[PDB]
Scaffold this motif. Sequence first.
Motif, PDB file in Angstrom:
ATOM      1  N   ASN A 104       4.084  -3.487  -1.954  1.00 29.64           N
ATOM      2  CA  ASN A 104       3.542  -4.022  -0.717  1.00 29.64           C
ATOM      3  C   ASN A 104       2.291  -4.842  -1.030  1.00 29.64           C
ATOM      4  O   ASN A 104       1.540  -4.508  -1.949  1.00 29.64           O
ATOM      5  CB  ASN A 104       3.177  -2.901   0.257  1.00 29.64           C
ATOM      6  N   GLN A 112       1.655  -0.548  12.216  1.00 29.40           N
ATOM      7  CA  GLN A 112       1.133  -0.604  10.856  1.00 29.40           C
ATOM      8  C   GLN A 112       1.799  -1.769  10.138  1.00 29.40           C
ATOM      9  O   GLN A 112       2.834  -2.269  10.594  1.00 29.40           O
ATOM     10  CB  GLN A 112       1.389   0.712  10.102  1.00 29.40           C
ATOM     11  N   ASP A 144       6.224  -1.760   6.011  1.00 24.75           N
ATOM     12  CA  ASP A 144       6.350  -1.085   4.719  1.00 24.75           C
ATOM     13  C   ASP A 144       7.654  -1.533   4.067  1.00 24.75           C
ATOM     14  O   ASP A 144       8.689  -0.869   4.139  1.00 24.75           O
ATOM     15  CB  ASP A 144       6.300   0.428   4.897  1.00 24.75           C
ATOM     16  N   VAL A 170       8.656  -1.610   1.061  1.00 19.35           N
ATOM     17  CA  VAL A 170       9.262  -0.779   0.025  1.00 19.35           C
ATOM     18  C   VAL A 170       9.962   0.425   0.642  1.00 19.35           C
ATOM     19  O   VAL A 170      11.051   0.811   0.205  1.00 19.35           O
ATOM     20  CB  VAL A 170       8.212  -0.369  -1.029  1.00 19.35           C
ATOM     21  N   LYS A 171       9.367   1.019   1.680  1.00 13.67           N
ATOM     22  CA  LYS A 171      10.007   2.142   2.356  1.00 13.67           C
ATOM     23  C   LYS A 171      11.275   1.698   3.072  1.00 13.67           C
ATOM     24  O   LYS A 171      12.284   2.413   3.066  1.00 13.67           O
ATOM     25  CB  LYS A 171       9.033   2.789   3.340  1.00 13.67           C
ATOM     26  N   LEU A 172      11.246   0.520   3.687  1.00 15.98           N
ATOM     27  CA  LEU A 172      12.374   0.006   4.451  1.00 15.98           C
ATOM     28  C   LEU A 172      13.351  -0.802   3.609  1.00 15.98           C
ATOM     29  O   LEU A 172      14.374  -1.247   4.137  1.00 15.98           O
ATOM     30  CB  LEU A 172      11.860  -0.842   5.613  1.00 15.98           C
ATOM     31  N   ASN A 173      13.061  -0.996   2.321  1.00 11.40           N
ATOM     32  CA  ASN A 173      13.948  -1.709   1.401  1.00 11.40           C
ATOM     33  C   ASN A 173      14.191  -3.133   1.911  1.00 11.40           C
ATOM     34  O   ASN A 173      15.327  -3.592   2.054  1.00 11.40           O
ATOM     35  CB  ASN A 173      15.262  -0.934   1.212  1.00 11.40           C
TER      36      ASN A 173
END
Length: 126
Positions: A3, A44, A47, A49-52
């Motif tokens: 991110n 926020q 994200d 990386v979290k959500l690909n």
Amino acid sequence: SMNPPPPETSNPNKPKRQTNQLQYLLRVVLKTLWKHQFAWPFQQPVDAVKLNLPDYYKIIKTPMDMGTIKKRLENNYYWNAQECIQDFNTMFTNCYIYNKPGDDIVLMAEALEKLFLQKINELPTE
Ligand SMILES: Cc1cc(C)cc(Oc2nccc(-c3c(-c4ccc(I)cc4)ncn3[C@@H]3CCN(CCN)C3)n2)c1
């Protein structure tokens, strides 16, 4: 990839001031939008990386979100109310840019933007 860092939310080299519009933007506009049932994807930085979503920050080069806006208001980062309004608009247009018309997430942003515009159409005079 990683991110990117969030947007700047504090700057000691900028002057600070408080107005009847800036408190309204934090007390009425930001708070109402934050508590809306559709607000959670916008509270926020995305994200990726979290959500690909490895393409998000290749596509979105001016990120913005309500968590950053809340912090900017809290740190007196904005001198003029238009700066804060621009950040809200950047947030909504980021969602529209990354997605396509009629995606569920876009319907979410449009409801929030409609409420946003209603509350800005009632902004108090300086
Ligand atoms: C409805 C939903 C679905 C899923 C799986 C997760 C979710 O939660 C969440 N959290 C954070 C961001 C996003 C997001 C954003 C967005 C962009 C700019 C900003 I400012 C705010 C959010 N654009 C797309 N998505 C999601 C990724 C995949 N996409 C599906 C393709 N349309 C939907 N979604 C919500």
